Amino acid sequence: PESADLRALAKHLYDSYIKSFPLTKAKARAILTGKTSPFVIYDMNSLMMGEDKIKFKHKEVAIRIFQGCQFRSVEAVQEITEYAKSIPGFVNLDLNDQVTLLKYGVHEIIYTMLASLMNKDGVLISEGQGFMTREFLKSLRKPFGDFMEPKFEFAVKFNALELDDSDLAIFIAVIILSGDRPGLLNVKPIEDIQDNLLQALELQLKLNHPESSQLFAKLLQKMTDLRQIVTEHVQLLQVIKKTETDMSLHPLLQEIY
Amino acid sequence: NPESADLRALAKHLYDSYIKSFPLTKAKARAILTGKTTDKSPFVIYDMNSLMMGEDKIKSKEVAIRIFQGCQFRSVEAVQEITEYAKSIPGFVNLDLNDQVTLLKYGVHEIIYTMLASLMNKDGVLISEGQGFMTREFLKSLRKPFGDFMEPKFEFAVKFNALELDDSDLAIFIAVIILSGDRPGLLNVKPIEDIQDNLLQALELQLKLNHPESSQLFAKLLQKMTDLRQIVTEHVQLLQVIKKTETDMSLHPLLQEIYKDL
């Protein structure tokens, strides 16, 4: 009777996730392990060539790579926002609450999905057209050399769970419906939905990974890791603001971010 | 079945050790707080004058400092109780000795604040084994530095207490907190995860059996671990500010080692 509505919710979220996100984990994995070619950016020259032959839409190199990261993050926010609207009950919530949920949830989701594009050696960029190495990113100067490393460390641990797209679709939804975000006006509806998304995620993981003991608990514990990454990220972005005088963009451009 | 029977046995063991390791339980704390009795009544410290009379009731030169050192001693004592409970956790003492220290190093404060909630309500906190009760306002009324050390704990407490867990639930939960295979610097992560995995199963069954109508309590409880980390970080930072404003205030050696490189 009810275990049916959970599978329906599960399938529904998956389908919606496929529609909203261009580069899925299944695709990114094939590209990454080989069994699928991505242009590789591992040093200054390879970057120079990559952006002149492939011209990635997203003066100093460290500063330009950091900005392309923001640009892509803004692009990603729209995909997540669209995906959110497909979660049963989301659009029916108080409008301000929907905005608050998205405002605080996009960073957690961004790093969660970013892991689907990373391995211990690098990250896929431009919808898989490229692969920027971990070492090259770690070789950037000033405080740019370590803005991505924290995401890599998190990815290696998160990816060990071996979740697939269908697992992630429900996890992303649970992240969005967090009732502890500041400023919420009506927490009950939000938590009632997350509670339903959590039961669906639990069944999904038990069916999809019978051998993975307590994968559910283990995945939920990763929330701690995600928020640490986010808070740490906010603090790095601030320091870049407090200092760094070559970050200037067109006034309209800066408004966009 | 055999499996769940083993998980219930584990829960009983943990609860039994918990009663033996922690003098002041949540059950005793609630009984005092809900003042349903005439013998468990605590003396209430809500201001300076009352504080002065409390010292005569409850059987280094400033108010904030004295209260602060009183907490330092208590947490040091709490660390010793938690360390005693930890040993009862099947498999814990059998792990590499370096990892035992590491697990305790990062787990004691998360557990301390988890358990402290048992002694809190929205208005204050039990002290001196429940004999006294210090109000939230009095504590928030302290000098600029110490004035806001406890507020974050109260905010967590009222929310965590909303879960209405009891001692038997908490015993397995604090056991899970300790057996965290993702602590910084762990040598052999697998044996730790194998134990936590088994504790997580015990906690899951326990919650379902003890709170049948509390949908997804297990998950809600796990998400609370995020709040614990947060309270710990804020506190760590709050201490750095203290040792700079109060060059004359001393921190107990044990706690300094726990916060070191944390």
Ligand SMILES: CCCOc1ccc(C[C@@H](Cc2ccccc2)C(=O)O)cc1CNC(=O)c1ccc([C@]23C[C@H]4C[C@H](C[C@H](C4)C2)C3)cc1
């Ligand atoms: C003020 C209530 C706060 O109650 C707290 C708060 C945090 C902590 C742990 C904290 C300690 C610390 C924080 C920062 C740095 C290192 C460690 C930690 O390390 O996590 C423990 C207690 C438990 N506290 C008690 O049970 C408790 C018992 C007796 C008193 C006295 C009250 C007055 C009368 C008498 C003498 C003085 C004044 C002290 C007894 C005060 C507190």
